[PDB]
Every structure is written in C-alpha cells, then in structure tokens.
Design a protein around this ligand. Structure first.
Ligand SMILES: CCCCCCCCCCCCCCCC(=O)O
Ligand SMILES: CCCCCCCCCCCCCCCC(=O)O
Lengths: 161, 161
C-alpha cells in the first residue's frame, strides 16, 4: 500500500555502504524474534549496469548471522524493483539523498498491512534523527505494528547484536 | 529518566478494565520475544483503599500465557509507585483521563535507557489514535528502541495472540 516513491531516482547513486538504522513492519511477527522473515540487515547495495540491484545483507538464520545475496530486478518504474524470489516481493524506494539516508519498503504484493516492512538506511553508524523523522513521517500512513531502532555500537556488529 | 507525571492523579479513578494498546522499551530485548521481561499485558488495575495498587496482567512464561498478580506500593508522590520486588522497579503515571487512556512507564531505577518500558493503556479494545499520539509524543524524549501496537482482535485474546 505504499503511496510514497522517490521521483527521479538515480539508482547508481545509492551504491556502497548502508546501515539499517530502524525497521518497521505491518505485523509484529515479521520483525519479532532474531530470525523473523523480514528482520534483515543491509550491508551494501550494488546496482547493476543494467539498472538492476544486487543486495548484500545479513540475516539471522538457524541461530547465527548469515550473509545473504539477493537480486532486485529493475522495473518499468525506477523506484520499484522485484526481488527474484517466490510469492512476488516488491521493493519500493520512498526517498533518499544518496549520501545520508534511504527510505525503502518491502511488500508481499497483496495489500497494505498484508506483508509490509520498511527501513531507514543511513550511510554512517550514527543515529540520524533527521532521517528517523522522515522515516516515521512516511510511515505515519502505514499500518505498522512493530518498530526497531539500533544504536551506533549495534550498527558496527554483525546482525546488530 | 521519565520527566512527565500526571498532576493531581486520582488513583481510585483508574480502576477497572484496561488494554495494553502499545508498548515501548529502551532496549529491544525487553519486548522482543514472547517471553521478554517487560512484555506484559495488563488486564485490570485494582487500587487499594490505602492508595496502593493491585495489578492484574498476563505474561508469557515458559511457552504459555500466565496470569500474574503484582502489587505497586504507593509513594510520597502520587503518580509514582514501587513494585514489591527486587532490583527496585518504579512505576510512573504520566497522563490519563481515567476513562479512555493511561500513559505509564516502568524503570529499573538506574537511568533512562538503563531499563525503561512504557505502555498506552486504553479502556476499550479499539485502537485510539488520540491516545497513541500522546503516547508517542510523551516518548519522543525517551531513548526507546522497540515499540509495539496491537489490533482489536489481538486485544481480545490472551497475551494478545
Ligand atoms: C534501493 C533498495 C535498497 C533496499 C534493499 C532492499 C532490501 C532487501 C529486501 C528483500 C530481502 C529479502 C528477504 C530476506 C532475505 C533472505 O531471506 O535471503
Ligand atoms: C497506574 C499504573 C498502571 C500500570 C500498571 C503497571 C504495570 C506493571 C509494571 C511492572 C510489571 C512487573 C514485571 C512483569 C510481571 C511479572 O513478571 O510478574
């Protein structure tokens, strides 16, 4: 159900180092335990010359932090990509300045609170209230029910432990 | 570190039925799993003639919802009570109208983000954006890192399952 998208996105310009500052989901179970489905920690974004998106992240799987590699396929809309996987999962870029934050959402393309998850990406292991403001504003319309935030020390650890 | 307290509290007037609408803690681990330390669901408040506070709640203990009974001892300040337990745990009433919401916090009396947890109590199994607004406002100053919200259907279930 996400209604915000970044106009004139330059997907080449969001490459490099990112930290998952905060996370929010429509249902508590998507982010609840350490091995929840959308409880992922993004490490780096590597956009393909063909404007695709190679995504590096950590995800707590079977009692330990495992580095993952996912591909987001480009789409006729430049802020929306499709993850190459089952049950179709769309990735929407809401807003970014490329150099400080990146607001994106994740939705099992079925409905709003159906299966929704969003994050606040920031380039540094600092908490950025500016980015978090915008993060919560953007989500204000969304049926979010769980919301995480991490501290600098946590951001420098695998799986934010 | 909580800096808001309800002036002129009438602790006799907050008795009866309450629902835990939302929860927030200074550290993710206090509310994370189903059996986290401050992941409690308040059922009813029963204030003692001697202005003490008998508290009824559910808490997921050893893989199942267990009803608990805790006593909050009155204090020289009327919005602050001490739970009869170890490691001194203070309970602060931030704000209420007795008939719709009640904002309270819980702090292992050591420091702000040390061990903090707050809730948004409401009299009905309805989501009250008014109460949730005020809830988030009050917490705006607080180092909260986890935040839960529940839906009507969940509020009518034991342990909000
Ligand atoms: C511009 C895009 C930046 C944000 C990148 C989107 C993050 C990935 C979203 C889908 C992750 C896949 C679900 C968990 C991963 C896994 O289990 O392998
Ligand atoms: C006016 C006060 C209303 C709010 C009531 C405070 C709720 C209780 C706070 C402390 C709960 C004790 C911790 C978990 C309970 C247990 O393990 O038995």
């Amino acid at each position: 159900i996400v209604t915000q998208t970044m106009k004139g996105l330059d997907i080449q310009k969001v490459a490099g180092t990112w930290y998952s500052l905060a996370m929010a989901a429509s249902d508590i179970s998507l982010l609840d335990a350490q091995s929840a489905p959308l409880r992922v920690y993004v490490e780096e974004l590597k956009p393909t010359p063909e404007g695709d998106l190679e995504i590096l992240l950590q995800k707590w799987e079977n009692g330990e932090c495992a580095q993952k590699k996912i591909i987001a396929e480009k789409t006729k809309i430049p802020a929306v990509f499709k993850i190459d996987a089952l049950n179709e999962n769309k990735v929407l870029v809401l807003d970014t300045d490329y150099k400080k934050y990146l607001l994106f959402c994740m939705e099992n393309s079925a409905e709003p609170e159906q299966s929704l998850a969003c994050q606040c990406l920031v380039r540094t292991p600092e908490v950025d209230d500016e980015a978090l403001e915008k993060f919560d504003k953007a989500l204000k319309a969304l049926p979010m029910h769980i919301r995480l935030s991490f501290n600098p020390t946590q951001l420098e650890e695998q799986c934010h432990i």
